[PDB]
Scaffold this active site. Sequence first.
Site, short mmCIF file in Angstrom:
data_model
loop_
_atom_site.label_atom_id
_atom_site.label_comp_id
_atom_site.label_asym_id
_atom_site.label_seq_id
_atom_site.Cartn_x
_atom_site.Cartn_y
_atom_site.Cartn_z
N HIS A 143 -35.14 -11.95 23.76
CA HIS A 143 -35.84 -13.09 24.34
C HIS A 143 -36.57 -13.92 23.28
O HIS A 143 -37.16 -13.36 22.36
CB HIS A 143 -36.82 -12.63 25.44
CG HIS A 143 -37.86 -11.67 24.95
ND1 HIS A 143 -39.13 -12.08 24.58
CD2 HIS A 143 -37.84 -10.33 24.80
CE1 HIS A 143 -39.83 -11.03 24.20
NE2 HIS A 143 -39.07 -9.95 24.32
N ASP A 144 -36.49 -15.24 23.41
CA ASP A 144 -37.29 -16.18 22.60
C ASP A 144 -36.91 -16.26 21.13
O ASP A 144 -37.67 -16.80 20.32
CB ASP A 144 -38.78 -15.87 22.72
CG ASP A 144 -39.26 -15.82 24.14
OD1 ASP A 144 -39.28 -16.89 24.80
OD2 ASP A 144 -39.64 -14.72 24.60
N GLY A 156 -37.41 -9.62 20.42
CA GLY A 156 -37.90 -10.95 20.78
C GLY A 156 -38.57 -11.73 19.66
O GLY A 156 -39.08 -11.15 18.70
#
Lengths: 276, 276, 276
Positions: free
Chosen positions: A120-121, A138
Amino acid sequence: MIHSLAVVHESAKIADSAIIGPFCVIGKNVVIGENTELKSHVTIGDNAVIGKNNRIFQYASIGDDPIDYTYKKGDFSQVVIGDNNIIRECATIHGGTAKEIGVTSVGNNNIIMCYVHIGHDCKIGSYINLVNGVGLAGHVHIDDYAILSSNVGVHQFCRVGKHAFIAHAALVGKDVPPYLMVTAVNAGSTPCGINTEGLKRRGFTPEEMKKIKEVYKVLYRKGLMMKEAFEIIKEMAKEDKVLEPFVDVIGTSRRGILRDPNSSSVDKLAAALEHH
Amino acid sequence: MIHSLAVVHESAKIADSAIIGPFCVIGKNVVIGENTELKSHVTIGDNAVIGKNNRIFQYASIGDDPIDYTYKKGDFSQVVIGDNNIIRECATIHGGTAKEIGVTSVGNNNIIMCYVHIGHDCKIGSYINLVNGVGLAGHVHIDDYAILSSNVGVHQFCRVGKHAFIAHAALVGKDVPPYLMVTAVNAGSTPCGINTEGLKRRGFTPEEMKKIKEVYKVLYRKGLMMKEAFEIIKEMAKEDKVLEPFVDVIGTSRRGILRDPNSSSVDKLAAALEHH
Amino acid sequence: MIHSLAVVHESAKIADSAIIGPFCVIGKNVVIGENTELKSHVTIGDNAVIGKNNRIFQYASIGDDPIDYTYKKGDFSQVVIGDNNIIRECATIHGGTAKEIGVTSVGNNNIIMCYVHIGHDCKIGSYINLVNGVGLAGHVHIDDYAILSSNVGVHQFCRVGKHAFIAHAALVGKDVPPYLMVTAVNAGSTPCGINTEGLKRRGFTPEEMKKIKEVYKVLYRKGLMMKEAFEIIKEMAKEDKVLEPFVDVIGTSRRGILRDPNSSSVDKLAAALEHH
């Protein structure tokens, strides 16, 4: 053509020239651009945006839920992918989270190989190779032209600077300055000179490579502390703009800069035992 | 039987007794032999040849494009697989490239486990175990009966000799002589005696094992350089043919032979401090 | 709802509120409980029992054949999964073998991430995190609240005690006492103090943490042999029941207890060079 055996949500926007193979599953509000192929068995999560000329292989999962204990259903999650990418079998690219902007992004002309995980991200740049089994937790930033070899792991919030090379199974827990070679210190990672092979191939000149190597020395071989080294690097960057990426990565570091913990064994003071 | 929910190109030749499960995708000019089962969700690339009595599990990708920057569409790419193999979930076996002959080959009676990657132009022998997460970069030769444990990585052009055992997460960057135990030197690999357990199980006699261990000594414990050791090994092989695989692997090495870099600490000269 | 494009054996029992996505394959005599979702492309093997509120992602393989040379078709093989679990992409959970009871079991509230492998006959507890690429060979016990970080490998028959934390790419070849932090000794693993962060988060009190740390000292810092240390720990556990899991893991060890091989460098006798 959208294969008759694919599942596509009616709100998805798919260019005429896109190929959606059999047994693909395409979620809500997805956009897939011109000349992109999804071979077979590809899952595209809600809100995903995929550009042109992409080739995505079977069992790749793109744009689905983040693995983040802070995530809850009702959060907006998205993956953006640019153009001319190759994404190989069993790759997983997860959407972003609410604690940032809810976006994972991938740029252009990348090769993302088998079993690669982009958490994520993450922000992935352009012209990058992520070799089989690379795992990015992430919030990881990978800058243009970087090579991360097989089974490389990068911890959360770390950055790999432009043109870096990370060797097989290295664990990256600090920010990696641009142009560096990084080898596995078995568990962890250490600086191992400059990525001279990649740099020559990408059209870097002797003058540019000389300056990059001098920055390597300033960082790791002159017995200087990071404050003193950074000040010298900033002055160097004024005259030679090929050094600007050093200023970027070091200046904006979240997790500190990758060090050689054993530099005192091989620095100027260790190797200077004579006059002249 | 070919499941009604499988996708099979009309040019594919599939034996009557073959089982093609649901959601399999079978490409152009594929041949699948007698009594081979493709459980479900299996992708078979164009030109692939699969023998008899094979069991291939869900999400295995076989015979698809190489990951090679030198590859371009229009190149002939093929995987050949023999008989009696088990290929587990999420395994990836890629076809060959134009710089050799365009063929990746797998022999008979192998166990290829979960997430195993066999890259372009590999030659895999028979009776081999590739444990979960093994990764073989292009042009890797694995000889008969070899065991590569979980997460073992082998770099391009390397060879693992017959009956070798490679321990968990070892990185193989040089050729491995037959019969050896190899442990992870954390990052890299080192010789750790002879695979006595595998050898006993496969019917090797005390006389044979004695000669194999003597070759281990010649290579790694007598303070000899590779030229001198190889000459001794060649003479030994005349009398005892169980040593012939040593002559093969060492004689034809592309990447050099795996060494013990710290042999000088434990060799004859280090351990002989008395007469008699 | 069972998607029209899923394959479900007629003997399967699926709760009304279960969601079986497209291209799922569900085998013989499977039971799937209330409110469990199988997103898409999920394979469920024969005899599998899955509880309520589970979320299983694409390309996960659950309850299929063990990888065990002792296994033969005709053996009963089963996976049991509890409630409230998340099982991510490309995870593999294999059934048990005939040499035990033929059951692999997973408890409640677990997060099993991408490419995670749970081998035959494992016993996974509750509230556990198995981070991407974790591999558990057969007969592995993971106790409640344990965290195994990315690419952690655990050899056959090993146990990880409650609330332990295993760092990135550590190899676990011995039993891990509860509450411990374990780091990668590059190849292998070593004790690195107590999991104070997890313990604080889970509501452990200063008094409890003080006793747990004292057990750490008894085990690894007082120059005691395992027999002597275990006897002291047993007495400690009488007064303070938070120590009972130490008695469990050490007392019933199959593979021996994880040691610090270099404790003699930092133990009481090394650090006591003065009176008082």
